[PDB]
Short mmCIF file of C-alpha atoms in Angstrom, two decimals:
data_model
loop_
_atom_site.label_atom_id
_atom_site.label_comp_id
_atom_site.label_asym_id
_atom_site.label_seq_id
_atom_site.Cartn_x
_atom_site.Cartn_y
_atom_site.Cartn_z
CA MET A 1 -100.72 62.20 -22.00
CA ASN A 2 -102.37 59.68 -19.71
CA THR A 3 -104.98 60.02 -16.88
CA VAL A 4 -105.45 58.09 -13.46
CA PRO A 5 -109.12 58.84 -12.62
CA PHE A 6 -110.34 58.58 -9.01
CA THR A 7 -113.93 57.14 -8.28
CA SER A 8 -114.14 59.61 -5.37
CA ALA A 9 -112.00 60.96 -2.40
CA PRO A 10 -114.14 59.96 0.73
CA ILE A 11 -111.23 60.82 3.22
CA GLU A 12 -108.92 63.78 3.58
CA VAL A 13 -105.56 62.92 2.23
CA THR A 14 -102.31 64.24 0.80
CA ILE A 15 -101.95 62.84 -2.79
CA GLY A 16 -98.55 62.67 -4.21
CA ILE A 17 -97.81 62.18 -8.00
CA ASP A 18 -94.05 61.56 -8.50
CA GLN A 19 -92.40 64.81 -6.81
CA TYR A 20 -95.74 66.76 -6.66
CA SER A 21 -98.44 66.83 -3.91
CA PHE A 22 -101.92 68.22 -3.38
CA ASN A 23 -104.24 68.29 -0.34
CA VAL A 24 -107.77 66.81 -0.97
CA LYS A 25 -110.46 67.44 1.59
CA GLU A 26 -112.99 64.71 2.91
CA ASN A 27 -115.58 64.37 0.02
CA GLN A 28 -114.06 67.08 -2.09
CA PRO A 29 -115.16 66.42 -5.87
CA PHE A 30 -111.72 65.15 -6.95
CA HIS A 31 -111.76 62.71 -9.86
CA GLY A 32 -108.00 62.31 -10.40
CA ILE A 33 -104.81 63.24 -12.24
CA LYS A 34 -104.56 63.94 -16.00
CA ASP A 35 -101.67 65.10 -18.48
CA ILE A 36 -99.33 62.40 -16.94
CA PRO A 37 -96.19 62.14 -19.19
CA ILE A 38 -96.02 58.76 -21.21
CA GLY A 39 -92.67 57.10 -21.39
CA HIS A 40 -91.80 57.03 -17.51
CA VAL A 41 -92.78 55.03 -14.50
CA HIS A 42 -94.84 57.12 -12.01
CA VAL A 43 -95.80 56.68 -8.36
CA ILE A 44 -99.09 57.91 -6.82
CA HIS A 45 -98.83 58.12 -3.05
CA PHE A 46 -101.00 58.94 -0.15
CA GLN A 47 -100.85 60.19 3.49
CA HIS A 48 -104.20 60.30 5.26
CA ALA A 49 -104.75 63.70 7.09
CA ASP A 50 -106.19 61.66 10.14
CA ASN A 51 -103.08 59.14 10.28
CA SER A 52 -99.83 60.65 8.87
CA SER A 53 -98.54 57.08 9.62
CA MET A 54 -98.49 54.65 6.64
CA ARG A 55 -97.36 56.66 3.70
CA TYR A 56 -98.37 54.16 0.78
CA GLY A 57 -98.50 54.27 -2.91
CA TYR A 58 -98.50 52.60 -6.38
CA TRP A 59 -95.70 52.48 -8.99
CA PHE A 60 -97.31 52.16 -12.52
CA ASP A 61 -96.57 52.67 -16.20
CA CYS A 62 -99.74 54.04 -18.13
CA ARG A 63 -98.51 52.22 -21.19
CA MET A 64 -99.24 48.83 -19.47
CA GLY A 65 -102.99 49.45 -19.01
CA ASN A 66 -105.81 51.87 -17.76
CA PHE A 67 -105.52 52.42 -14.01
CA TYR A 68 -107.77 54.18 -11.41
CA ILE A 69 -107.81 54.85 -7.79
CA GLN A 70 -110.93 53.81 -5.73
CA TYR A 71 -111.16 54.25 -1.86
CA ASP A 72 -111.88 50.72 -0.20
CA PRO A 73 -113.88 51.67 3.04
CA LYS A 74 -113.12 48.06 4.56
CA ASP A 75 -109.26 48.15 4.04
CA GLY A 76 -109.32 51.93 4.70
CA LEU A 77 -107.08 52.81 1.74
CA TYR A 78 -107.01 54.35 -1.68
CA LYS A 79 -106.50 51.31 -4.00
CA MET A 80 -105.11 51.18 -7.52
CA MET A 81 -107.09 49.10 -9.94
CA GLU A 82 -106.93 48.18 -13.64
CA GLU A 83 -109.99 48.80 -15.95
CA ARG A 84 -109.97 46.11 -18.58
CA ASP A 85 -112.84 47.72 -20.56
CA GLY A 86 -111.08 50.46 -22.66
CA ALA A 87 -114.30 52.16 -23.77
CA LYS A 88 -115.79 52.29 -20.18
CA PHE A 89 -112.44 54.03 -19.13
CA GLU A 90 -112.19 56.54 -22.01
CA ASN A 91 -115.84 57.36 -21.44
CA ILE A 92 -115.16 57.90 -17.58
CA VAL A 93 -111.93 59.95 -18.18
CA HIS A 94 -113.71 62.15 -20.87
CA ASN A 95 -116.61 63.06 -18.51
CA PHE A 96 -114.15 64.01 -15.56
CA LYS A 97 -112.08 66.04 -17.88
CA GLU A 98 -115.27 67.79 -19.41
CA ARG A 99 -116.38 68.77 -15.69
CA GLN A 100 -112.59 69.76 -14.97
CA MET A 101 -112.67 67.52 -11.80
CA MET A 102 -108.93 66.50 -12.35
CA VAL A 103 -105.60 68.12 -11.28
CA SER A 104 -103.08 68.44 -14.16
CA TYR A 105 -99.61 66.77 -13.72
CA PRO A 106 -97.86 70.03 -13.24
CA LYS A 107 -94.61 69.44 -15.26
CA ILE A 108 -92.51 72.57 -16.08
CA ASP A 109 -91.28 72.30 -19.68
CA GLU A 110 -87.57 72.89 -18.76
CA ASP A 111 -87.65 70.45 -15.84
CA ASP A 112 -85.98 67.03 -16.42
CA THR A 113 -86.18 66.19 -12.64
CA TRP A 114 -88.48 63.15 -12.90
CA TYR A 115 -86.67 61.62 -16.00
CA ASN A 116 -83.22 62.20 -14.16
CA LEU A 117 -84.74 60.43 -10.92
CA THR A 118 -86.18 57.56 -13.04
CA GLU A 119 -83.75 57.20 -16.02
CA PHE A 120 -82.99 53.58 -15.43
CA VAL A 121 -86.20 52.56 -13.42
CA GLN A 122 -88.29 49.90 -15.39
CA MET A 123 -91.70 48.74 -14.36
CA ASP A 124 -90.73 45.05 -15.27
CA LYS A 125 -87.81 45.42 -12.74
CA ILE A 126 -90.13 46.99 -10.00
CA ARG A 127 -92.45 44.05 -10.31
CA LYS A 128 -89.56 41.58 -9.46
CA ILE A 129 -88.56 43.58 -6.44
CA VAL A 130 -92.31 43.95 -5.29
CA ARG A 131 -93.99 40.67 -6.13
CA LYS A 132 -97.78 40.67 -6.92
CA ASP A 133 -97.97 39.33 -10.40
CA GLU A 134 -101.82 39.57 -10.71
CA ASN A 135 -101.37 43.40 -10.89
CA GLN A 136 -99.44 45.48 -13.46
CA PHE A 137 -98.81 48.09 -10.78
CA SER A 138 -96.82 47.92 -7.43
CA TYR A 139 -97.90 48.70 -3.90
CA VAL A 140 -95.14 50.07 -1.45
CA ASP A 141 -95.52 51.70 1.96
CA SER A 142 -93.44 53.01 5.00
CA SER A 143 -93.38 49.70 6.90
CA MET A 144 -92.47 47.16 4.11
CA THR A 145 -89.25 45.33 5.07
CA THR A 146 -86.66 44.12 2.67
CA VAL A 147 -85.58 40.44 2.05
CA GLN A 148 -82.26 41.43 3.70
CA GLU A 149 -83.99 42.97 6.90
CA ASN A 150 -86.07 39.78 7.14
CA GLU A 151 -82.81 37.62 7.31
CA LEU A 152 -81.44 39.84 10.20
CA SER A 153 -91.25 38.47 8.52
CA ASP A 154 -94.01 38.02 5.81
CA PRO A 155 -92.17 37.15 2.55
CA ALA A 156 -95.39 38.24 0.42
CA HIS A 157 -95.28 41.99 1.51
CA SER A 158 -91.37 42.23 1.24
CA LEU A 159 -89.11 44.39 -0.95
CA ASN A 160 -86.98 41.88 -3.06
CA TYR A 161 -83.82 44.21 -3.39
CA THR A 162 -80.63 42.54 -4.35
CA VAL A 163 -78.90 41.54 -1.20
CA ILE A 164 -75.48 43.36 -0.80
CA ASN A 165 -73.30 42.37 2.24
CA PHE A 166 -69.63 43.45 2.28
CA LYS A 167 -68.78 40.59 4.85
CA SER A 168 -70.37 37.78 3.05
CA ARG A 169 -68.87 34.82 1.03
CA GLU A 170 -70.47 36.35 -2.03
CA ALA A 171 -68.47 39.47 -1.61
CA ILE A 172 -65.28 37.89 -0.65
CA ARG A 173 -63.15 35.25 -2.70
CA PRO A 174 -61.25 32.74 -0.62
CA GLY A 175 -57.57 33.80 -0.41
CA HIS A 176 -58.44 37.55 -1.61
CA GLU A 177 -59.98 38.49 1.96
CA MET A 178 -57.99 41.62 2.31
CA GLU A 179 -57.98 42.60 -1.42
CA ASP A 180 -61.76 42.05 -1.85
CA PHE A 181 -62.79 43.75 1.50
CA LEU A 182 -60.51 46.97 0.92
CA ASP A 183 -61.21 47.06 -3.00
CA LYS A 184 -64.92 45.85 -3.76
CA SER A 185 -64.07 45.83 -7.63
CA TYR A 186 -64.69 41.95 -7.74
CA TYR A 187 -67.98 42.12 -6.09
CA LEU A 188 -69.22 45.16 -8.04
CA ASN A 189 -68.00 44.13 -11.41
CA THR A 190 -68.06 40.23 -11.49
CA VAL A 191 -70.70 39.15 -8.90
CA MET A 192 -73.22 42.05 -9.13
CA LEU A 193 -72.79 43.69 -12.62
CA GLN A 194 -71.88 40.55 -14.77
CA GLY A 195 -73.45 38.05 -12.40
CA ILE A 196 -76.85 39.34 -11.06
CA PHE A 197 -77.79 42.82 -12.72
CA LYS A 198 -76.34 41.88 -16.15
CA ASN A 199 -75.62 45.64 -16.92
CA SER A 200 -75.14 49.00 -15.17
CA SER A 201 -78.56 50.10 -16.24
CA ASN A 202 -80.35 47.46 -14.06
CA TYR A 203 -78.02 48.40 -11.21
CA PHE A 204 -78.81 52.08 -11.55
CA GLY A 205 -82.63 51.23 -11.88
CA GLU A 206 -82.58 49.36 -8.54
CA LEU A 207 -80.45 52.13 -6.76
CA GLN A 208 -82.91 54.84 -8.24
CA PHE A 209 -86.09 52.87 -7.18
CA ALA A 210 -84.55 52.35 -3.62
CA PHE A 211 -84.00 56.05 -3.29
CA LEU A 212 -87.40 57.04 -4.41
CA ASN A 213 -89.04 54.49 -1.86
CA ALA A 214 -86.82 55.93 0.80
CA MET A 215 -87.88 59.50 -0.03
CA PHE A 216 -91.57 59.08 -0.73
CA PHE A 217 -92.46 56.47 1.97
CA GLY A 218 -89.59 56.99 4.44
CA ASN A 219 -89.08 53.20 3.86
CA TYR A 220 -85.93 52.55 6.05
CA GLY A 221 -84.91 49.25 4.18
CA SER A 222 -84.94 51.15 0.86
CA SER A 223 -82.74 53.91 2.36
CA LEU A 224 -80.29 51.05 3.49
CA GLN A 225 -80.32 49.57 -0.08
CA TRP A 226 -79.73 52.99 -1.79
CA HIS A 227 -76.59 53.61 0.54
CA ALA A 228 -75.25 50.03 0.15
CA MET A 229 -75.36 50.35 -3.71
CA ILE A 230 -73.63 53.73 -3.58
CA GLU A 231 -70.89 52.50 -1.11
CA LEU A 232 -70.32 49.42 -3.29
CA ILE A 233 -69.39 51.64 -6.27
CA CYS A 234 -67.39 54.20 -4.22
CA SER A 235 -65.49 51.29 -2.48
CA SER A 236 -64.40 49.86 -5.84
CA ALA A 237 -60.98 50.97 -7.26
CA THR A 238 -62.06 49.88 -10.82
CA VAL A 239 -65.37 51.18 -12.04
CA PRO A 240 -66.31 51.80 -15.78
CA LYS A 241 -65.61 55.79 -16.40
CA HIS A 242 -69.35 55.82 -17.85
CA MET A 243 -70.75 54.29 -14.72
CA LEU A 244 -68.83 56.80 -12.47
CA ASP A 245 -70.09 59.85 -14.74
CA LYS A 246 -73.77 58.52 -14.57
CA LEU A 247 -73.50 57.85 -10.91
CA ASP A 248 -72.43 61.51 -10.39
CA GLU A 249 -75.63 62.68 -12.20
CA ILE A 250 -77.90 60.17 -10.55
CA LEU A 251 -76.83 61.22 -6.98
CA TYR A 252 -76.85 64.93 -7.96
CA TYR A 253 -80.53 64.86 -8.74
CA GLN A 254 -81.35 62.70 -5.62
CA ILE A 255 -79.60 65.16 -3.32
CA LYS A 256 -81.15 68.09 -5.29
CA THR A 257 -84.73 66.71 -4.84
CA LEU A 258 -84.36 65.46 -1.09
CA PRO A 259 -86.58 67.65 1.16
CA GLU A 260 -84.00 69.75 3.18
CA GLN A 261 -85.70 68.91 6.47
CA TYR A 262 -85.41 65.02 5.85
CA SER A 263 -81.57 65.12 5.28
CA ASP A 264 -81.06 64.07 8.84
CA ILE A 265 -83.07 60.67 8.60
CA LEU A 266 -82.51 59.95 4.76
CA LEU A 267 -78.68 60.48 4.53
CA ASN A 268 -76.12 58.15 6.26
CA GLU A 269 -73.19 60.47 7.59
CA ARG A 270 -70.79 57.45 7.59
CA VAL A 271 -71.46 56.41 3.90
CA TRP A 272 -71.38 60.06 2.43
CA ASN A 273 -68.27 61.00 4.24
CA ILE A 274 -66.48 57.81 3.24
CA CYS A 275 -67.81 58.03 -0.52
CA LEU A 276 -66.86 61.84 -0.96
CA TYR A 277 -63.71 62.06 1.23
CA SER A 278 -62.04 58.51 1.80
CA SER A 279 -63.27 56.08 -1.00
CA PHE A 280 -61.35 55.29 -4.24
CA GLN A 281 -64.02 57.44 -6.00
CA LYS A 282 -63.61 60.50 -3.70
CA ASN A 283 -62.62 62.69 -6.60
CA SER A 284 -64.99 61.09 -9.23
CA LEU A 285 -68.32 62.67 -7.94
CA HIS A 286 -67.69 66.37 -8.70
CA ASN A 287 -71.37 67.45 -9.26
CA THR A 288 -72.62 65.30 -6.15
CA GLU A 289 -69.74 66.58 -3.89
CA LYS A 290 -70.49 70.27 -4.90
CA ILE A 291 -74.39 69.90 -4.15
CA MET A 292 -73.73 67.93 -0.86
CA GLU A 293 -71.12 70.60 0.42
CA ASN A 294 -73.45 73.51 -0.38
CA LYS A 295 -76.75 71.96 0.77
CA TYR A 296 -75.71 69.67 3.74
CA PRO A 297 -72.24 70.90 4.89
CA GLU A 298 -73.35 69.90 8.46
CA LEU A 299 -73.69 66.06 7.54
CA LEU A 300 -69.93 66.40 6.46
CA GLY B 1 -70.54 41.65 22.24
CA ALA B 2 -67.53 43.13 24.16
CA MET B 3 -65.67 41.19 26.94
CA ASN B 4 -65.42 43.50 30.16
CA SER B 5 -65.01 43.40 34.13
CA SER B 6 -68.87 42.29 34.12
CA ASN B 7 -68.47 39.07 32.02
CA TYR B 8 -64.79 38.17 33.12
CA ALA B 9 -65.72 34.72 34.48
CA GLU B 10 -66.77 33.59 31.00
CA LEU B 11 -63.07 33.17 30.12
CA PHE B 12 -62.71 30.25 32.55
CA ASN B 13 -65.88 28.29 31.54
CA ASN B 14 -65.82 25.10 29.34
CA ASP B 15 -66.59 26.92 25.98
CA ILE B 16 -63.28 26.90 23.92
CA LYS B 17 -62.04 30.47 23.52
CA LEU B 18 -58.91 32.14 22.28
CA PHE B 19 -57.57 35.77 22.86
CA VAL B 20 -55.66 37.09 19.79
CA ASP B 21 -53.19 39.92 20.34
CA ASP B 22 -51.47 41.48 17.12
CA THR B 23 -49.43 44.12 18.99
CA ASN B 24 -46.04 42.25 18.28
CA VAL B 25 -46.87 41.05 14.70
CA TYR B 26 -45.26 44.03 12.82
CA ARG B 27 -42.17 45.32 14.83
CA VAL B 28 -39.70 47.92 13.54
CA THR B 29 -36.51 49.75 14.62
CA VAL B 30 -36.59 53.53 13.53
CA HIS B 31 -33.11 54.75 12.40
CA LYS B 32 -31.46 57.61 10.33
CA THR B 33 -30.29 56.96 6.72
CA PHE B 34 -26.95 58.24 5.53
CA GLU B 35 -28.97 61.13 3.75
CA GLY B 36 -30.31 61.95 7.32
CA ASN B 37 -33.86 60.74 6.44
CA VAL B 38 -35.57 58.20 8.66
CA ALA B 39 -36.25 54.49 7.54
CA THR B 40 -37.63 51.47 9.56
CA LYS B 41 -36.00 48.02 9.63
CA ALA B 42 -38.68 45.26 10.41
CA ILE B 43 -37.69 42.59 12.96
CA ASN B 44 -39.35 39.34 13.70
CA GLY B 45 -42.74 39.46 15.32
CA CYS B 46 -45.39 37.14 16.64
CA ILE B 47 -49.11 36.50 16.90
CA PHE B 48 -50.06 35.83 20.58
CA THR B 49 -53.05 33.42 20.44
CA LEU B 50 -53.87 32.19 24.03
CA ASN B 51 -56.51 29.79 25.42
CA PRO B 52 -57.09 31.63 28.86
CA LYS B 53 -58.57 28.29 30.43
CA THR B 54 -55.73 25.92 29.50
CA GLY B 55 -52.84 28.26 29.11
CA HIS B 56 -52.17 26.87 25.59
CA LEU B 57 -50.31 29.58 23.58
CA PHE B 58 -50.11 29.24 19.78
CA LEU B 59 -47.14 31.56 19.08
CA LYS B 60 -47.09 32.11 15.33
CA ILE B 61 -43.67 33.63 14.41
CA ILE B 62 -43.92 36.38 11.78
CA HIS B 63 -40.67 36.47 9.92
CA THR B 64 -39.55 39.65 8.38
CA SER B 65 -39.76 38.06 4.85
CA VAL B 66 -43.61 38.33 4.98
CA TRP B 67 -43.21 42.06 4.72
CA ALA B 68 -40.80 42.04 1.68
CA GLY B 69 -42.12 44.31 -1.12
CA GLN B 70 -45.52 44.93 0.70
CA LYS B 71 -46.96 48.39 1.16
CA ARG B 72 -49.08 49.72 4.19
CA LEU B 73 -47.61 47.13 6.55
CA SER B 74 -49.50 48.20 9.80
CA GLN B 75 -52.68 47.33 7.70
CA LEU B 76 -51.41 44.21 6.17
CA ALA B 77 -50.28 43.07 9.68
CA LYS B 78 -53.87 43.00 10.81
CA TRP B 79 -54.98 40.88 7.78
CA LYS B 80 -51.80 38.60 8.04
CA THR B 81 -52.88 38.12 11.79
CA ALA B 82 -56.39 37.29 10.71
CA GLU B 83 -55.15 34.75 7.88
CA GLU B 84 -52.73 32.99 10.50
CA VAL B 85 -55.55 32.70 13.20
CA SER B 86 -58.00 31.38 10.35
CA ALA B 87 -55.45 28.84 9.14
CA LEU B 88 -54.79 27.79 12.85
CA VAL B 89 -58.56 27.28 13.45
CA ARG B 90 -58.73 25.16 10.11
CA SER B 91 -55.77 23.05 11.33
CA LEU B 92 -57.55 22.17 14.54
CA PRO B 93 -59.92 19.25 14.90
CA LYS B 94 -63.65 20.42 14.88
CA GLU B 95 -63.90 19.52 18.69
CA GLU B 96 -60.89 21.76 19.46
CA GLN B 97 -61.96 24.83 17.47
CA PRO B 98 -62.85 27.83 19.54
CA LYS B 99 -66.51 29.00 19.90
CA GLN B 100 -65.24 32.48 20.42
CA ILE B 101 -62.08 34.55 19.59
CA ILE B 102 -61.52 37.78 21.48
CA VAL B 103 -59.16 40.47 19.85
CA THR B 104 -57.30 42.62 22.20
CA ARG B 105 -57.56 45.47 19.67
CA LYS B 106 -60.80 46.58 17.75
CA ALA B 107 -58.83 47.03 14.52
CA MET B 108 -58.71 43.11 14.40
CA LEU B 109 -62.56 42.66 14.22
CA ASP B 110 -63.11 43.16 10.50
CA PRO B 111 -60.01 41.40 9.32
CA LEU B 112 -60.66 38.32 11.44
CA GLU B 113 -64.51 38.21 10.70
CA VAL B 114 -63.74 38.36 6.94
CA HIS B 115 -61.16 35.60 7.21
CA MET B 116 -63.72 33.49 9.51
CA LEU B 117 -66.79 33.71 7.07
CA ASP B 118 -66.39 29.90 6.66
CA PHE B 119 -67.00 29.66 10.56
CA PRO B 120 -70.36 31.62 11.03
CA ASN B 121 -70.84 29.95 14.49
CA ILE B 122 -67.56 31.26 15.82
CA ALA B 123 -68.20 34.56 17.56
CA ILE B 124 -65.52 37.22 17.03
CA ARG B 125 -65.50 39.72 20.01
CA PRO B 126 -63.69 42.88 21.21
CA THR B 127 -62.75 43.45 24.78
CA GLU B 128 -62.95 46.52 27.08
CA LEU B 129 -60.16 45.05 29.21
CA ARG B 130 -56.68 46.50 28.85
CA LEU B 131 -54.65 43.21 28.60
CA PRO B 132 -50.85 43.49 28.76
CA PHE B 133 -50.25 40.78 26.14
CA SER B 134 -47.83 43.31 24.26
CA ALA B 135 -45.33 42.38 27.06
CA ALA B 136 -45.18 38.72 25.75
CA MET B 137 -41.71 39.65 24.20
CA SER B 138 -40.44 40.55 27.67
CA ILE B 139 -40.66 36.56 28.44
CA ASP B 140 -37.11 35.62 27.61
CA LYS B 141 -37.96 32.25 26.08
CA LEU B 142 -40.66 33.69 23.62
CA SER B 143 -38.47 36.61 22.72
CA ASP B 144 -35.53 34.11 21.87
CA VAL B 145 -37.67 31.84 19.58
CA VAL B 146 -39.00 34.92 17.66
CA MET B 147 -35.67 36.62 17.20
CA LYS B 148 -33.77 33.37 16.16
CA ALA B 149 -36.58 32.33 13.60
CA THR B 150 -35.11 32.23 9.95
CA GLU B 151 -38.55 31.25 8.50
CA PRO B 152 -42.43 31.34 9.42
CA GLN B 153 -42.84 28.98 12.44
CA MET B 154 -45.70 28.07 14.86
CA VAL B 155 -44.38 27.30 18.56
CA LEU B 156 -46.71 25.89 21.17
CA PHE B 157 -46.21 26.82 24.79
CA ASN B 158 -48.16 26.54 28.09
CA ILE B 159 -47.95 30.12 29.40
CA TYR B 160 -49.01 28.90 32.84
CA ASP B 161 -46.23 26.24 33.08
CA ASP B 162 -47.49 23.67 35.62
CA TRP B 163 -49.65 26.33 37.69
CA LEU B 164 -53.12 24.54 36.93
CA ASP B 165 -51.87 21.55 38.94
CA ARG B 166 -52.18 23.90 42.05
CA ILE B 167 -54.51 26.80 41.17
CA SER B 168 -57.59 27.53 38.95
CA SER B 169 -57.39 29.09 35.50
CA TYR B 170 -58.94 32.36 36.96
CA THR B 171 -56.01 32.59 39.45
CA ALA B 172 -53.46 31.41 36.72
CA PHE B 173 -54.81 34.12 34.37
CA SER B 174 -54.77 36.82 37.24
CA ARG B 175 -50.98 35.81 38.01
CA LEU B 176 -50.21 35.94 34.20
CA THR B 177 -51.82 39.46 33.70
CA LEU B 178 -49.97 40.67 36.93
CA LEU B 179 -46.64 39.46 35.65
CA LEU B 180 -47.15 40.98 32.13
CA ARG B 181 -48.45 44.35 33.47
CA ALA B 182 -45.25 44.49 35.67
CA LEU B 183 -42.93 43.63 32.74
CA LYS B 184 -44.90 46.26 30.57
CA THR B 185 -44.67 49.04 33.35
CA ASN B 186 -40.90 48.35 34.28
CA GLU B 187 -39.25 45.51 32.47
CA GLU B 188 -35.90 45.78 34.29
CA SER B 189 -37.59 45.76 37.80
CA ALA B 190 -40.06 43.07 37.01
CA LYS B 191 -37.19 40.78 35.70
CA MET B 192 -34.98 41.55 38.73
CA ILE B 193 -37.94 40.68 41.05
CA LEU B 194 -38.40 37.33 39.14
CA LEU B 195 -34.61 36.28 38.85
CA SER B 196 -33.06 37.86 41.93
CA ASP B 197 -32.76 34.57 43.92
CA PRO B 198 -30.63 32.21 41.88
CA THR B 199 -31.73 29.10 43.96
CA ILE B 200 -35.15 29.30 42.24
CA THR B 201 -34.67 28.39 38.37
CA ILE B 202 -36.93 28.16 35.30
CA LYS B 203 -37.20 24.42 34.25
CA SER B 204 -36.15 23.84 30.65
CA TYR B 205 -39.91 23.09 29.63
CA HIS B 206 -41.14 26.31 31.53
CA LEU B 207 -41.29 30.01 30.86
CA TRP B 208 -41.33 31.30 34.56
CA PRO B 209 -39.39 30.26 37.86
CA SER B 210 -40.39 27.24 39.84
CA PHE B 211 -41.91 29.26 42.75
CA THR B 212 -43.58 27.44 45.90
CA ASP B 213 -47.10 28.80 46.64
CA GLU B 214 -45.45 30.97 49.42
CA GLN B 215 -42.82 32.37 47.02
CA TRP B 216 -45.61 33.27 44.46
CA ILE B 217 -47.57 35.27 47.09
CA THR B 218 -44.17 37.24 47.85
CA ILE B 219 -43.49 37.58 43.99
CA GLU B 220 -47.21 38.71 43.32
CA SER B 221 -46.80 41.32 46.16
CA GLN B 222 -43.49 42.64 44.78
CA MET B 223 -45.27 42.95 41.40
CA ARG B 224 -48.11 44.92 42.72
CA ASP B 225 -45.67 47.32 44.68
CA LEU B 226 -43.68 47.71 41.41
CA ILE B 227 -46.90 48.74 39.62
CA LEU B 228 -48.19 51.10 42.09
CA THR B 229 -44.78 52.97 42.56
CA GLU B 230 -44.46 53.30 38.67
CA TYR B 231 -48.19 54.68 38.71
CA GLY B 232 -47.21 57.33 41.30
CA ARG B 233 -44.10 58.30 39.30
CA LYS B 234 -46.12 58.32 35.91
CA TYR B 235 -48.86 60.61 37.47
CA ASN B 236 -47.01 62.52 40.21
CA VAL B 237 -49.75 61.39 42.80
#
């Protein structure tokens, strides 16, 4: 079990840790989050009580170093930082635990929700999508635009998701225009899986990361990326059976987790109707189709 | 975006553009089989690709052999249309290539955009206009060359004959759309109006009769009357 200590909480803020969230009052004696499961990436996220604009947060993996949060009164945000002195860090965490100033990561034993949302998500892959190589953790917020969004402005603060465009030379082989546009198997299997991602694990990792950025920060570009990666699989007539089975599970947990009240802005009606009812894979996503139909029958 | 009544004059500027109409590409007769089921027999079709400024018509004849052993023909027809327009653009010298292609039907946008990915600077556009280019097969000489084709063939016409010697491309296009609208609404009546007076003939190198300016005004009046009558019939108004 790992710990993310906080120097202090000078401003009133909703703090998220993965799918959990806690209200902290201005100058409340809060010194961080303990009992964080090792073996998973995590995201610690923030919405200021005084400006519900700019949800922001840090993707991190506690195996890659000792991380803490400290409010920066100049930049006006909770910043993640690395403590290189292991003994200074253990000493700080031990003190705060002894004084019970920390919230416990409130995992239910039965509950595989966070594993199911992050199964393929790797910190090394997050750091290639979010470039800031001097830190081992990754900052994301509501407003960050994708490399693709910037093509259609500051490249330093961009989400470097894999560009997917169904009406691109990359997606369409000369002389297979109709075939490649109506059945995207070539684009999925040769260009994206064999060519760019190398395997379905990295593809699902980016898909899962895109969803979580859409859900936790309302990052619009991430939502576009999550939908594009779903639609590329559903629009392919030839998909490995293991990828289809795994996609059904991935999407099931994403739909299960989505706040009911955010379905209207995080779910694209056209893509879901197409994927569940028109696409080649319309009969391959049983779990996902059952939860969508019972939870969001209005969208369909 | 879309071509409408508001941006009509753009058709007659000096930016090269083509209209593409796919409505006569896939044509069938529906008939009964011996077992009393229904079957289609394909007949020769054509892509109607028209420069509205010059009157140059690139009539790509679609021979029935292109459908042999193919499924989902109404869908393939859109993609075959897009392939043939793309091949026509690539065959033209750079300075003759269109800056814009306007499709008369929205179902052509994605097929043509995908075939023209090599031409990112050519704008593919829909139109709000209800253009009567479906009636192209009511022009006897175009109908004749399509039905006689025994293989795929491109035939070049000027759909305005020699009109641009006397009128602007705006007025030539208005005359053409009124003739095609008439032919589409009541073909027999339209063709009767055009050919009733045997003294006015069609030159061998033309599609339409050799009317004087005065006889065109009368013809155009008879076509407008034909169209309003048929409208009052259609709609009991």
